[PDB]
């Protein structure tokens, strides 16, 4: 694939660690299911035909992975000659020792058959130096909702009836913190033998770290022919963990 005449003024590479953390918790707060899907994407502009050693802290427990076709399998880490441009290096999955960036603590209080009292607290759980962002919390309402009143100190919240959820949104929030929201759900009457099974509360967030604790140790570039070595390459790395399915039962 990768031709041989590749020459660049700046020999740069950018390492993207993209993780998707999935969690199902009890209202109590017990984890009922949790895994992390991951991939590592490389965007590089290096001259020649480079030999690349990618090094991480495999420490962490990685539970399977599939590679791209130019990988010398045999720590044993990964050596490879990368296509120019952008390509996916490896793709892994984790279930042990996962950082769960947010705890969602729900509280519901019936009031006759008219009202429903709802309080939901999110607890960020990471380095306070670090900011989660793009935070959304989804709280389903019943179908016989007549109307919804909400208050929250941080961020904004509307009741979307088309969707039967209260959607609370928070632009940023630092590790080890708390925010809470409170709603009064005004109810219509309905078929009383049919009770309301409480759908889970779901969250979406983005965090500048990998919730699987994968770190990147080294990416050593070796050029035999051309007169640049490893400590010449500008290297950059970011981690972007996002919520997959992330639901607290209630």
């Amino acid at each position: 694939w990768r031709r041989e005449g590749i020459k660049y003024r700046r020999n740069e590479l950018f390492l993207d660690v993209l993780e998707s953390v999935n969690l199902l918790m009890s209202p109590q707060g017990q984890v009922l299911s949790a895994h992390v899907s991951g991939r590592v994407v490389m965007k590089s502009y290096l001259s020649g035909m480079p030999e690349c050693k990618f090094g991480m802290n495999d420490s962490i427990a990685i539970d399977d992975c599939t590679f791209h076709q130019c990988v010398r399998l045999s720590e044993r880490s990964i050596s490879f000659i990368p296509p120019d441009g952008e390509f996916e290096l490896m793709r892994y999955r984790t279930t042990k020792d996962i950082i769960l960036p947010f705890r969602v603590i729900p509280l519901v209080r019936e009031v006759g058959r008219t009202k429903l009292e709802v309080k939901v607290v999110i607890k960020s759980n990471f380095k306070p130096s670090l900011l989660a962002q793009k935070i959304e919390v989804r709280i389903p309402t019943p179908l016989n909702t007549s109307g919804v009143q909400v208050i929250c100190m941080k961020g904004k919240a509307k009741y979307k009836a088309s969707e039967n959820a209260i959607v609370w949104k928070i632009k940023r929030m630092a590790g080890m913190k708390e925010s809470q929201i409170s709603a009064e759900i005004e109810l219509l009457p309905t078929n009383d033998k049919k009770k309301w099974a409480r759908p889970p509360i779901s969250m979406n967030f983005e965090v500048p770290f990998a919730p699987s604790g994968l770190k990147v140790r080294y990416l050593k570039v070796f050029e035999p022919k051309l007169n640049y070595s490893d400590h010449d390459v500008i290297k950059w790395v970011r981690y972007i963990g996002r919520s997959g399915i992330y639901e607290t039962r209630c």
Partner: peptide
């Protein structure tokens, strides 16, 4: 912003 430098 983008990234932070490898180290």
């Amino acid at each position: 912003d983008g990234y932070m430098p490898m180290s």
